[PDB]
Structure 1
Amino acid sequence: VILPEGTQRYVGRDAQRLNILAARIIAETVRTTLGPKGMDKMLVDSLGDIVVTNDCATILDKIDLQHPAAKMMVEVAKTQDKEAGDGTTTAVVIAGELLRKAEELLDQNIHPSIIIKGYALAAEKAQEILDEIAIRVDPDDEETLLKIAATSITGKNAESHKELLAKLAVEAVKQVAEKKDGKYVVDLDNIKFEKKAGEGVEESELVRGVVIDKEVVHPRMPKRVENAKIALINEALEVKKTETDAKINITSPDQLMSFLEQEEKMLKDMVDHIAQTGANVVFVQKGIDDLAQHYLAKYGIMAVRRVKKSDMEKLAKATGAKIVTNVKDLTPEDLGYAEVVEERKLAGENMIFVEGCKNPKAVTILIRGGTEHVIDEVERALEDAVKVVKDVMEDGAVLPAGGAPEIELAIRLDEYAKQVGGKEALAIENFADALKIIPKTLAENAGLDTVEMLVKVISEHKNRGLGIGIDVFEGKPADMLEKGIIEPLRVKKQAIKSASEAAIMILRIDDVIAAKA
């Protein structure tokens, strides 16, 4: 034929209008979750599985979006979550709003070219305004670092114990943190989250070490060790074999017994190499023969087999131990330390706690909660609580919350609009207006008077200053700095980046050609 049937195409206004609509819809879908008063969503996938969350990234990810432009709105939250860790909603909402105001200009007949260029200037000029107004704080200031973490947790469900969770999140990042070049660098992978139902979120805590979901491989081995000298062996503690094909040919009765002992020996020899280093705790990545388990047990050594590669590494980093491939070359220096290593039946489940390490470079947070739901949402809160603390240590720059930065950006970006002037100024004025959905949908979700509320806030801000924003807990504008309600200078900078990029990306597509969706 001439072109695949069932393949639709849209051009000009059509393409743009739809893409913008799609994006806007998806955006309004998540805006009901913005801020402390935000509502939750219930996602029921095709396999009955139920996900109840406040998290934008999860919602957009779990929801089966079909329209292309709406799938692009997912990337926005994806990039946000991966760069600043928080403000995923903020970015998606601003992206849709930007796209709405952008259409107003299109209807008005302004060339897409002009709108794009104006958004760029408004965007670039926006970063500038933020870097400048950013309250530069001390990279490791316990004080402000606790606030950043708590303000992040006060946006989701588990805000009932923002106290504890913030403490743990700040604590856990300071521990695994790294600063040998002047400024900090935080590899968050060095923080494992352990979730176990039962108890209360009150029982959640920081394990300065690692928690592994395995058990002691043999009955006779110790279930607890005081000052453990841990050995990390990534080798199969079993009867080795030659690469070259080989088979034993018993020719006389006494051979049956000799060969078995030959292997017992081999097995007992490897275990000896491990006992000699003075190790009383061994984590093996591969398997462990039964006989090897026997000798290991006699020496009063605690061993666990089939340890997850990712677990091995966290043990190495938390105990100071060294992973080895050959037991023969194992030395006491390869061993690591843990003030206590014990198997505990937490919720009828057997887990091993490698706690009380010297100075772990990897640490674990144990999350406790009444239901799977309570837990999964607390973990989601901590991951943001942690990702933001990480941003402040590497950045040493914070901003007030409650739309305060967007209000400032709006007011300011409008002046800039004037000096730019022309068609461009229209785009720059619209872009600056768009930034208001944050303060807007913030008081909205809180059940306040949008229209009226936004007028007092743009007033106070113009009067009192940059620290003025909306306080959904106050129902009135307030100095967010005085209330410690702040957020990473990176969260805003990345939201603005992602949003405008998306907005502009769509504003540039003048034709859509799809086949089956």
Structure 2
Amino acid sequence: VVILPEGTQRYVGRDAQRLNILAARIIAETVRTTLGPKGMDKMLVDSLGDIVVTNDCATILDKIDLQHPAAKMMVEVAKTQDKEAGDGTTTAVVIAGELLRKAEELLDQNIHPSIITKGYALAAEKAQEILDEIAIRVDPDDEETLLKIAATSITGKNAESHKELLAKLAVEAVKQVAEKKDGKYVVDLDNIKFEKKAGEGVEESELVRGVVIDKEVVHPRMPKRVENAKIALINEALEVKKTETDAKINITSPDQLMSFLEQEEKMLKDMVDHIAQTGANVVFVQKGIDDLAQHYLAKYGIMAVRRVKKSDMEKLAKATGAKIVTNVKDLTPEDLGYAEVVEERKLAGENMIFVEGCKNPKAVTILIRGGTEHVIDEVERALEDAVKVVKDVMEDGAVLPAGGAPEIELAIRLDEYAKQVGGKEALAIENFADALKIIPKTLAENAGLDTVEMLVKVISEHKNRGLGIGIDVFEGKPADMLEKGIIEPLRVKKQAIKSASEAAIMILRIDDVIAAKA
């Protein structure tokens, strides 16, 4: 009896489970090869022919056009991990897939999914308690640890050769814009701008304690450089203003043609004279600037830029100290900001404006250079992560060893926790624990090392030497990650397990898939 439209696909019971799990596993296997120091990159070409080259799991899954529903669900794991902690997007997806693979073994044994799910929930919740406890507490602004955090992040990506420079830029940027409420830091990454310009190489990238704007000085006669600049920030256009209410001039005599023309000329001139009277010698206008206004600005020796993006206006205010004024007439000297140097320079033959040497900038700019556009897009992505993990640590004065040390610590301990729980739930908890080993395993795998042996050695050494013991993919053997300065934010592991877990549990609870005809 026709219930569903023709074309509808339906999978139930083990079929639905097998399909969903295999799809999540394949997605995970697909990105696991990007994991770690020896992890490699992917080239993604969309339907329009646009090209993306990354190592970033979140970027990869967001780009490829996935069909299977379960595979789509995995994308959400990478996305949420990316928004919360920056790093660990590959880790969260890979663990989620392994979690599902280990669970099907129990499903094949006929253990009820509610049992597997209960076990996984207990293990995930226990894992958070363990992470909070083993986490190494540190000074939120300790520069050395911060640098280590950032450097660890910038490894296994094609800009690692400059990890020292890049890490240094990321840490300075975050600490500079970090807001200390009382004893805890808060960081708004919207205050750190990334400006990219192909040319030169990655080595030439730098941190500008101010703002770099992709704009030109509006008029040729205006100064191209201003030493101790007094910056004015106007968001209203420097043009003849018109009332909000409809209005029209009704002319009844010839002399009015000139009187109204002259009145508009005076209004334009007054605005500029007013700006000049504050002492400002540099002005950023968010809207346009009438030619007449430009001429007067130039006549006054004032450097002006029009059509400045709102977000840039805000960064300019935070960097220079100037206050954005809506109406030119409200502009006062107390509204002016400061910059050691404001100058129009060319990068790759393209004029740009630098606002540098600001006092205590609340907004900052990292100028990225590189031999090619693709290379520069990938450096920005590497910096986006570096900056997030540094932020993680400044807001959570906690870190963990890297190199799979944490997941090993969790596997050992969770396996012990399973024993105190007992029964079928214990089975699930042991599998959850075993699942966490894909990290060390894949780290070794991507490095071409014998995975079975590396595991035996690392777990054994870890049991003997403690928390910091992880895998050194370069030397191909266990090592103390803490001593090696190979660390990551506590938040990366915490969010990774939360997203991986709740998603695995959700997929494991599905025993019916009903898909309409596309």
When normalised by structure 2's length, the TM-score is 0.98
The Cα of 1:516 is off from its aligned counterpart by 3.4
Deviations along 1:134-180, one digit per CA (max 9) or x if unpaired, are 11111111111110100000132211110100000001000000112
Counterpart CA distance in 1 for 2:57 and 2:304 is 42
Counterpart CA distance in 2 for 1:278 and 1:516 is 68
Q: Give structure 1 stretches of 5+ with no counterpart.
A: none
Counterpart CA distance in 2 for 1:312 and 1:209 is 12
Secondary structure of residue in 2 paired with 1:162:
helix
The Cα of 1:291 is off from its aligned counterpart by 0.5
Deviations along 1:374-401, one digit per CA (max 9) or x if unpaired, are 1111111111111001111111111111
Counterpart CA distance in 1 for 2:32 and 2:517 is 29
The Cα of 1:255 is off from its aligned counterpart by 3.4
Counterpart CA distance in 1 for 2:300 and 2:432 is 71
* Deviation larger for 376-385 or 4-13: 4-13
Counterpart CA distance in 2 for 1:241 and 1:140 is 51
Secondary structure of residue in 2 paired with 1:333:
helix
Counterpart CA distance in 2 for 1:100 and 1:498 is 16
The Cα of 1:327 is off from its aligned counterpart by 1.3
Counterpart CA distance in 1 for 2:374 and 2:113 is 45
Counterpart CA distance in 2 for 1:508 and 1:336 is 58
Counterpart CA distance in 2 for 1:196 and 1:171 is 21
Counterpart CA distance in 1 for 2:352 and 2:516 is 50
The Cα of 1:295 is off from its aligned counterpart by 0.9
Could you tell me which residue of structure 2 aligns to residue 397 of structure 1?
A: 398
1:265-304 equivalent positions in 2, closer than 5 A: 265-304=266-305
Counterpart CA distance in 2 for 1:130 and 1:490 is 9
The Cα of 1:253 is off from its aligned counterpart by 4.1
Deviations along 1:39-62, one digit per CA (max 9) or x if unpaired, are 111111111111111110010001
Secondary structure of residue in 2 paired with 1:139:
coil
Counterpart CA distance in 2 for 1:457 and 1:180 is 42
Counterpart CA distance in 2 for 1:385 and 1:375 is 15
Counterpart CA distance in 2 for 1:15 and 1:196 is 49
Q: Share of identical aligned residues, percent?
A: 100
Counterpart CA distance in 2 for 1:62 and 1:156 is 18
Could you tell me which residue of structure 2 aligns to residue 366 of structure 1?
A: 367
Secondary structure of residue in 1 paired with 2:233:
strand
Could you tell me which residue of structure 2 aligns to residue 460 of structure 1?
A: 461
Counterpart CA distance in 2 for 1:181 and 1:18 is 51
Secondary structure of residue in 2 paired with 1:57:
helix
Counterpart CA distance in 2 for 1:134 and 1:338 is 42
Could you tell me which residue of structure 2 aligns to residue 26 of structure 1?
A: 27
Could you tell me which residue of structure 2 aligns to residue 155 of structure 1?
A: 156
Contact 2:269 2:296 in 1 (8 A): yes
Counterpart CA distance in 2 for 1:299 and 1:57 is 51
The Cα of 1:14 is off from its aligned counterpart by 1.4
Runs of 4+ residues deviating >6 angstroms: none
The Cα of 1:250 is off from its aligned counterpart by 4.3
Counterpart CA distance in 1 for 2:212 and 2:198 is 15
Contact 2:20 2:70 in 1 (8 A): yes
Secondary structure of residue in 2 paired with 1:323:
coil
Counterpart CA distance in 2 for 1:380 and 1:79 is 16
Deviations along 1:159-215, one digit per CA (max 9) or x if unpaired, are 111010000000100000011221000111110100100001110000000111111
Secondary structure of residue in 2 paired with 1:361:
coil
* Deviation larger for 9-18 or 423-432: 9-18
Deviations along 1:245-300, one digit per CA (max 9) or x if unpaired, are 33334444443333222111010011122111111011101111110111111111
Contact 2:401 2:468 in 1 (8 A): yes
Deviations along 1:210-257, one digit per CA (max 9) or x if unpaired, are 111111111111111111111110101111112333333444444333
Counterpart CA distance in 2 for 1:125 and 1:75 is 23
Alignment RMSD (CA, Å): 1.1
Q: Give structure 2 stretches of 5+ with no counterpart.
A: none
* Deviation larger for 500-509 or 90-99: 500-509
Contact 2:284 2:304 in 1 (8 A): yes
Secondary structure of residue in 1 paired with 2:333:
coil
Contact 2:40 2:156 in 1 (8 A): no
Secondary structure of residue in 2 paired with 1:352:
strand
Could you tell me which residue of structure 2 aligns to residue 357 of structure 1?
A: 358
Secondary structure of residue in 1 paired with 2:33:
helix
Change (3 A) 1:237 1:99: same
Deviations along 1:5-56, one digit per CA (max 9) or x if unpaired, are 2221222211111111111111100000100101111111111111111110
Secondary structure of residue in 2 paired with 1:66:
coil
Contact 2:198 2:372 in 1 (8 A): yes
Contact 2:462 2:468 in 1 (8 A): yes
Deviations along 1:76-135, one digit per CA (max 9) or x if unpaired, are 011111111101000000000001001110000000000000001100000111111111
Contact 2:404 2:470 in 1 (8 A): yes
Deviations along 1:417-466, one digit per CA (max 9) or x if unpaired, are 01101000000000000000000010000000011111111111111111
Could you tell me which residue of structure 2 aligns to residue 433 of structure 1?
A: 434
Counterpart CA distance in 1 for 2:40 and 2:330 is 58
Counterpart CA distance in 2 for 1:313 and 1:26 is 40
Secondary structure of residue in 2 paired with 1:41:
strand
Counterpart CA distance in 2 for 1:341 and 1:5 is 67
* Deviation larger for 324-333 or 250-259: 250-259
Deviations along 1:280-336, one digit per CA (max 9) or x if unpaired, are 011101111110111111111111110101111111111111111111121111111
Secondary structure of residue in 2 paired with 1:432:
helix
Could you tell me which residue of structure 1 aligns to residue 218 of structure 2?
A: 217
Counterpart CA distance in 2 for 1:270 and 1:120 is 65
Could you tell me which residue of structure 1 aligns to residue 321 of structure 2?
A: 320
How many residues align structurally? 517
Counterpart CA distance in 2 for 1:242 and 1:113 is 67
Could you tell me which residue of structure 1 aligns to residue 103 of structure 2?
A: 102
Counterpart CA distance in 1 for 2:181 and 2:426 is 46
